[PDB]
Design a protein around this nucleic acid. Structure first.
Lengths: 334, 311
RNA sequence: AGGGGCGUAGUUCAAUUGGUAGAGCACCGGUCUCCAAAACCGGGUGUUGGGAGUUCGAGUCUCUCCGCCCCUG
RNA sequence: AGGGGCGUAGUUCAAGGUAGAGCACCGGUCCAAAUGUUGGGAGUUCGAGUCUCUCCGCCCCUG
């Protein structure tokens, strides 16, 4: 079974695009694949932020993944900081990553108040994240192909010097989920990092907010009004259909037939009642999980236990190749 | 009691300058100070090298410190990598050290002048040295071998993290404390390719006699230093030596003097070095003792930073 | 550890010679759409880093603190 | 993932016609001082450090 590493950034309200395009289909693939979901809190402190907020953000992100359907029996779900092997391999990989590679990373080269070594050094740690678990499928994140390429460069550069300690990871492009485009720029896809949030709709949004946001979405000035799928000409109405089709499963031609003679104010309202209906169940659930302090502390405890087992195997193999003397655990440790 | 952290580079072979300069004294200081000795194998990989050699080295270096007199039950001696807290705090302190400060470092800027392995390692290491120090609530750091900037930075980071989160760290302070043979104008350093210009703690009289015979002989400083050595080897002074003392006699006398200083050192090493079970026990006990302290500091950082804690 | 510097609406920038902190962009309304956009029509930004001085008058001069930037070893 | 550039002895180097340096260190005072693998392979050529191709390592660049 192929092993898949995804990272859950503690900040960044999951959008309906994230859900329907990616995580929804990945919920249905936990038995075929060995999916690992790591809450990368050590990657978040690269940017300064409120200590209580990050702690709550970590716990928020956990419950929502659970709320999105990640089964902690089938899949491994943990907090990056709770598995030391991450920092630990991170340092060793610093010695097999070159200054220029890190500095030519398009993001950093761009950044202006916290040019910390975290910001610069994150891509090595992100390669330590992938490589510990012998990952072979990586779902290439947003604006982060560079990063996986650097992981592949690191792992080959290490394995070339010492042997196949690591699996070279390949990018994961699963079943393309729904096509969710930004609500005021249907040319652009929906991004969790969108500074203007009217292009987005988070998974935990008031039915009112869902309505207010789909109401402001861009349409066209076609007279007569038409609900037809033309991605070139009718983008915003195309997008409204792709979203709706995704929530309901109905086809684009079915939707067109259903909206014959209806205007856009109706399609909007209809798309908003369908979105918010989906998010009521997933929001019901979320709070159950978010309130169940015990259950949360258990999914963490069990989850990190499963990770830190698989990671120390790899970390031992690395430190062996490296030239280090092994930690002396107990007389009868092997 | 004042907590002293000192890092032990595996690869470098210790010189008589190191021992009479520091260790010999420090050995007789483990009851007044809380001394900590960290064999920094993770700082060693920033350069490429033979894996098997390092391993040996680490141990050779460990066993040599135990022979020079370091009590594993009075001090904390251990191998850096055997404590994860170091990389854990290294990562976190990476996010509080500025790109400028690091690039500004003399040691990097220069390798960025030309240019062999400009790796994240050569760049981020001064942060890891800061993790090394702040983990153990260090009070005093023996700064030597062009590592004053690295303490300054360690002080400057501790001041910064503290100023934002609480006084979780202690600001380290520089502890206030022989020249190279064929270049008395230069000091005797383990990091000198010419080991004819140095004299190892484990060198045998034949090799010790041989190396000193070629010593260049304040205006005759090769003489002056060759005498200074005896001054610390014998216990005598300069006037007693200026009176007691051709130059072959001085050379032959520092030979029998220094190799006579190395005796219990060498004899202890060969028993320690081969008793791998003893080493295994010393690395296990030091590491267990180090984690217990380092994990305490680390817990406090992880709470200040805002991380959810484990259990 | 020494040594230099910078700090203005959300953002990018002004404010001559010490005399009334303003623009673009973004954003917000209003008009406008079935809804949106666009289009017009307006609107509002600001801890001038914090504090202390100097002056009749300080974004402009001085000090101090803060944070960051640059330099050296 | 793509696109350029570089590679000579320990080190810095010199030079389509058969590879020279320097510095470094090793040889020759009581004591001390005071060389060739042109990255590898394959081509083109009478002839290849030089030209083409390919690989390897690193450097620069883009997202």
């Amino acid at each position: 079974k192929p092993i898949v590493f995804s990272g859950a950034q503690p900040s960044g309200e999951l959008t309906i695009g994230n859900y329907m395009g990616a995580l929804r289909q990945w919920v249905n693939m936990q038995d075929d694949y060995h999916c690992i979901y790591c809450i990368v809190d050590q990657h978040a402190i690269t940017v300064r932020q409120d200590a209580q907020k990050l702690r709550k953000a970590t716990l928020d992100t956990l419950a929502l993944y659970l709320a999105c359907g990640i089964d902690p029996e089938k899949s491994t779900i943990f907090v990056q900081s709770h598995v030391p092997e991450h920092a630990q391999l991170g340092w060793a990989l610093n010695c097999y990553t070159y200054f220029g590679e890190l500095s030519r990373m398009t993001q950093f080269k761009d950044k202006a108040e916290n040019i910390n070594a975290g910001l610069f050094d994150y891509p090595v740690l992100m390669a330590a994240d992938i490589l510990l678990y012998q990952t072979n499928l990586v779902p290439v994140g947003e604006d982060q192909k560079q990063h996986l390429e650097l992981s592949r460069d690191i792992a080959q550069r290490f394995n070339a010097l010492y042997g196949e300690i690591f699996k070279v990871p390949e990018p994961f492009i699963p079943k393309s989920g729904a096509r969710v485009m930004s609500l005021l720029e249907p040319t652009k896809k929906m991004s969790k990092s969108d500074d203007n949030r009217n292009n987005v709709i988070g998974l935990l949004e008031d039915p009112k907010s869902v309505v207010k946001k789909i109401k402001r979405a861009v349409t066209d000035s076609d007279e007569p009004p038409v609900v037809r799928y033309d991605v070139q000409n009718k983008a915003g109405v195309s997008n409204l259909l792709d979203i709706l089709s995704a929530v309901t499963g109905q086809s684009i031609p079915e939707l067109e037939k259903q909206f014959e003679g209806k205007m856009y104010g109706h399609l909007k309202g209809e798309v908003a009642d369908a979105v918010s209906g989906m998010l009521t169940e997933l929001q019901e659930r979320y709070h159950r999980f978010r309130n169940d302090e015990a259950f949360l502390q258990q999914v963490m405890k069990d989850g990190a236990e499963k990770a830190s087992a698989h990671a120390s195997r790899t970390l031992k193999a690395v430190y062996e190749a490296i030239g280090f003397v092994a930690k002396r655990h107990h007389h009868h440790h092997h």
